[PDB]
Design a protein that fits this description.
This is part of a larger assembly, with chains A (about 90 residues), B (about 70 residues), C (about 100 residues) and D (about 120 residues).
Chain A: H1 3-11, H2 23-42, H3 49-71, H4 73-83
Chain C: E1 2-10, H1 18-29, E2 35-36, E3 40-46, E4 56-66, H2 71-80, E5 84-90
Antiparallel strand pairs in C: 1-4, 1-5, 2-4, 3-4
Chain D: E1 6-12, E2 19-24, E3 29-34, H1 48-65, E4 69-75, H2 81-89, E5 94-100
Parallel strand pairs in D: 1-4, 4-5
Antiparallel strand pairs in D: 1-2, 2-3
Helix pairs in contact in D: 1-2
The chains are: A mainly alpha (about 90), B mainly alpha (about 70), C alpha+beta (about 100), D alpha/beta (about 120).
The structure holds one RNA strand of 165 nucleotides.
Subunit structure (chain C): Part of the 30S ribosomal subunit. Interacts weakly with uL2 in one of the 3.5 A resolved structures.
GO molecular function (chain C): mRNA 5'-UTR binding; small ribosomal subunit rRNA binding; structural constituent of ribosome
Organism (chain C): Escherichia coli (strain K12)
RNA sequence: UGCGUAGAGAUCUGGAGGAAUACCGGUGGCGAAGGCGGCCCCCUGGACGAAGACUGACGCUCAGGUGCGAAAGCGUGGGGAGCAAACAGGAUUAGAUACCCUGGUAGUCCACGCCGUAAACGAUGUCGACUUGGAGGUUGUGUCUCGUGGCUUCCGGAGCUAACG
C-alpha cells in the first residue's frame, strides 16, 4: 500500500481534519489491507502463514465494528454502507 | 607489559580489514582479541580495531578461535 | 529507479575480444534503460576459488541507475554470454 | 628416463599409513611408495618407521629418473608424517621447501561414522 | 569368507546422477512449538528506538467452540547414490533367532492425503506494581573514559526452597 494510497483513504474517512485514528478511519485501513490480502489468497493458496495475518486483521475489524455499532448505531450503518463489509 | 602491539608496528589504518599481516598481531594465541594492555591502542582505536577484526574474520582471513600450544 | 552495482567476471584468457563483450555489455546495460555513473576495471586478478576451472578472472565495476523492475531481466541477458562466468547485481554500499 | 631433475614430493600422512608420491612440476607422478609397498601388512604400516622406508624408496626410485631437488607437500596428520619428511631431507634429494597443504575442510561434508 | 595377471585396488582426465551442505559455528542466533543454518530476487509476519504528533481505556482471563500442532507408520504416484528394520551368510559363544564382518527389502528422498502424541521439561501460564548491586554482550539515544531505554547471559543483597537452586 503506497503512502498516498494510505493517506488518501484516511482523509476520505476522516471524521474531521487531522483525524488519524477513529473507528471509521481504522476500520477503513483494515478493510483496505484485508482486500489486498484476500486478493493475495486467490493466488498463493500455499501461503498459510499469511492466512493467520488476515485472521488477526479481520478479528480486529470485527471488534472495532462491534464497538461502534454498540455505541453509535448510526455511524455504523453509514460506515458499512460506504466500505461494503458484511 | 612486555611490548605493546602498537609500538612494535608502523602507522597503519585500523579501518583496513584486509591487511591480515598487521591484524594478526592483535590476535593472541587464540582468535581472541588482545586487551588494551597488550594492544597498546586506546578506546577510540580499540573499538575500531575490534570491528575491523570482526569483518576480517568473516572474510575468513582471521581465525575466530585457535588451539592452544 | 535507484542505484545498482553490476559486477561482471569473464574469462581472462580472452584476447582483443575483451573489448567487445563489454561492447555487448554496454549494449546490454542500454535498452535495459540503465545509466552508468562511474566505471572501475580491476582487470585480471587471483580468484579465491577456481570457477570455470580457470584460476583467474577479469573483474569490472559499473554502478548503474535503472528501474528496479528490469534489474532482473538485466541479469538474464548478461549470463548468456559464454565468456562471462558470473554477474551479481548488488543494491548499493558494500562493506 | 625423462630426467625430471626437479619436482614435488607429496606426503599423504595418515593414521592408517603414510604414502609418498614424487612428481614433476606438472603433477604427473613419476613414482610412488608406501609401507604396504615395503612389505608391511596393514597394522605395522602406520608406524613412522614404515614411513621412512617408503620415503627413501620412493625417493631412490626417483633418483633413477634423475631428479635431484623436490618440493615436499604434507597432507593430513598421522604417525610417520614428520618421519617421512626428514627421510626425504636425507636420501639423495635436496628438500627445497616444505608446505602443509593439508585440506582440513570448511562446511558441507558429513563426517564418517568414526568422526560422528 | 570374498575380490585379483579375459586386470579390480591404487593414480590422472572427462562425463552423469542423487543427496548432503566440509572453516566460519560458538560455550552464538531466530521461531509459538517442532524445528531452522551458501548466495540472489520476489512476497510476507513479528519486534525495537527516537519525535511525542493522533484516538482514548475500547481492559484481563477465558467452560464450550474453532484453528495450529515433532516423530512414527499408513494411502496413491514417482524416485532410489548412499544407509539400513525384516532378512541372506560368515564369525564369536556353552547357546547368540546380539554385539563384530559380507549382502540386503520396506523405509530413508520428492508430490499429495492421514494422525495429535511426547522427559510437547526451565518436568515452575499471562499482565501490572514493588525489592542491593557487579560483570559480558546485542540494539537506540544522550552533555559517549559515562548516563539512560528495550533484549540476551553469568555472579550475586534481602528474601524464597526439603535439598538442588
Amino acid at each position: 500500500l503506497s503512502t498516498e494510497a494510505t493517506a488518501k483513504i484516511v482523509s476520505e474517512f476522516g471524521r474531521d481534519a487531522n483525524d488519524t485514528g477513529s473507528t471509521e478511519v481504522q476500520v477503513a485501513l483494515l478493510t483496505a489491507q484485508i482486500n489486498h490480502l484476500q486478493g493475495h489468497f486467490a493466488e498463493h493458496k500455499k501461503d498459510h502463514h499469511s492466512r493467520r495475518g488476515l485472521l488477526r486483521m479481520v478479528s480486529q475489524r470485527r471488534k472495532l465494528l462491534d464497538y461502534l455499532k454498540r455505541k453509535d448505531v448510526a455511524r455504523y450503518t453509514q460506515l458499512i454502507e460506504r466500505l461494503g463489509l458484511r | 607489559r612486555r611490548k605493546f602491539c602498537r609500538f612494535t608496528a608502523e602507522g597503519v589504518q585500523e579501518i583496513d580489514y584486509k591487511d591480515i599481516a598487521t591484524l594478526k598481531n592483535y590476535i593472541t594465541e587464540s582468535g581472541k582479541i588482545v586487551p588494551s594492555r597488550i594492544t597498546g591502542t586506546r578506546a577510540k582505536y580499540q573499538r575500531q580495531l575490534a570491528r575491523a577484526i570482526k569483518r576480517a574474520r568473516y572474510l575468513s582471513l582471521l581465525p575466530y578461535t585457535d588451539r592452544h600450544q | 529507479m535507484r542505484h545498482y552495482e553490476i559486477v561482471f567476471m569473464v574469462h581472462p584468457d580472452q584476447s582483443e575480444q575483451v573489448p567487445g563483450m563489454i561492447e555487448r555489455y554496454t549494449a546490454a546495460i542500454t535498452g535495459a534503460e540503465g545509466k552508468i555513473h562511474r566505471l572501475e576495471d580491476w582487470g585480471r586478478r587471483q580468484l579465491a576459488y577456481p570457477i570455470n576451472k580457470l584460476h583467474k578472472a577479469h573483474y569490472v565495476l559499473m554502478n548503474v541507475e535503472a528501474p528496479q523492475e528490469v534489474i532482473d531481466e538485466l541479469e538474464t541477458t548478461f549470463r548468456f554470454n559464454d565468456a562471462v562466468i558470473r554477474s551479481m547485481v548488488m543494491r548499493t554500499k558494500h562493506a | 628416463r625423462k630426467q625430471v631433475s626437479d619436482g614435488v614430493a607429496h606426503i599423504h600422512a595418515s593414521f592408517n599409513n603414510t604414502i609418498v608420491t614424487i612428481t614433476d612440476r606438472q603433477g604427473n607422478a613419476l613414482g610412488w611408495a608406501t609401507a604396504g609397498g615395503s612389505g608391511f601388512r596393514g597394522s605395522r604400516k602406520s608406524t613412522p618407521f614404515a614411513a621412512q622406508v617408503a620415503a627413501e624408496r620412493c625417493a631412490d626410485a626417483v633418483k633413477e629418473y634423475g631428479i635431484k631437488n623436490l618440493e615436499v607437500m604434507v597432507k593430513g596428520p598421522g604417525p610417520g608424517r614428520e618421519s617421512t619428511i626428514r627421510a626425504l631431507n636425507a636420501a639423495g634429494f635436496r628438500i627445497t621447501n616444505i608446505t602443509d597443504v593439508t585440506p582440513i575442510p570448511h562446511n558441507g561434508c558429513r563426517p564418517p561414522k568414526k568422526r560422528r
